[PDB]
């Protein structure tokens, strides 16, 4: 029942999971989940969180945790092209370490699993 | 005392021009301004999702009407300051002190101003 895009187990409401080769810069790491950002949203207060993390968080809380400012999900916007580019190229290891020792950009893992990986 | 060096970056430039830095390492091309071809300073985001230096874009839009990457209509007033995270990534780029004859310190870009003010033997 593994995710077909990332090769790991998770709910739809939760992020894909990755095993990153290197230590990712803290500023690309989501404050909520403490993993590198996925589908980043910018807040009006200038902070950035995962779509899924922020959607889930705003069901329970109504303030940005970094600045305590009021936060509405509908006012959050997709982060810039630049930010998405930096996140896409982050290096990950294939989760099927039993057979596969491939290392690739995060945005490329899905195609590897769907088309090429014998472990998937 | 006449036409002195910038107090904040230690290099010679006019106020309408960007600060200047000597980068220690290759900077990721995604953090480089397409207009000036240096690492972004005071990044602004366009409605088309692109990012340029505040001073480069303002100068560019004086006689131009569009985004240099995609030629979509572009107005300076519709541009916005880039996210905190983009600023934070840029701040940590390593630079060399410009006063290379007397000082060999390497530091994060955001720290150069404080270095010149509080530490450098080469500043005035
Ligand atoms: Zn997944
Ligand atoms: Zn997150
Ligand atoms: Zn905030
Ligand atoms: Zn594989
Ligand atoms: Zn300067
Ligand atoms: Zn520029
Ligand atoms: Zn554009
Ligand atoms: Zn110095």
Author numbering:
A (entry chain A): 2 to 121
B (entry chain B): -1 to 122
Which passages does the manuscript contain on this structure?
The LNX (Ligand of Numb protein-X) or PDZRN (PDZ and RING) family of proteins comprises five members, LNX1–LNX5. The domain architecture for these proteins shows the presence of a RING domain (Really Interesting New Gene) and one to four PDZ (PSD-95, DlgA, ZO-1) domains. LNX2 is an E3-ubiqutin ligase known to interact with Numb and with a similar protein, Numblike. Moreover LNX1 and LNX2 bind numb—an inhibitor of NOTCH pathway —and lead to its proteasome-dependent degradation by ubiquitination thereby enhancing NOTCH signalling.
We found that a construct containing amino acids 20-147 of FL-LNX2 was functional and stable in solution. The structure was determined to 1.86 Å resolution. LNX2 (20-147 aa) exists as dimer in the crystal, with two molecules in the asymmetric unit. The structure consists of a core RING domain (Asp46-Arg90) flanked by two zinc finger motifs on either side (hereafter referred to as the Zn-RING-Zn domain). The core RING domain of LNX2 adopts a typical RING fold, comprising one central α helix, two antiparallel β strands and two long loops. This RING domain is stabilized by two zinc ions but, unlike the Cys4HisCys3 “cross-brace” formation, one of the cysteine residues is replaced by an aspartic acid residue; this has also been shown in a few other proteins, such as Rbx1. Although it fulfils the required criteria for a Cys2His2-type zinc finger, it does not adopt any secondary structure and does not conform to any known fold group of zinc fingers so far described. Collectively, these findings suggest that the N-terminal Zn finger motif is indispensable for the ubiquitination function of FL-LNX2. Notably, Lys109 of one monomer makes hydrogen-bonding contacts with Asp45 and Asp47 of the other monomer in the dimeric Zn-RING-Zn domain. We show that although LNX2 exists as a dimer in solution, this dimerization is not required for its autoubiquitination.
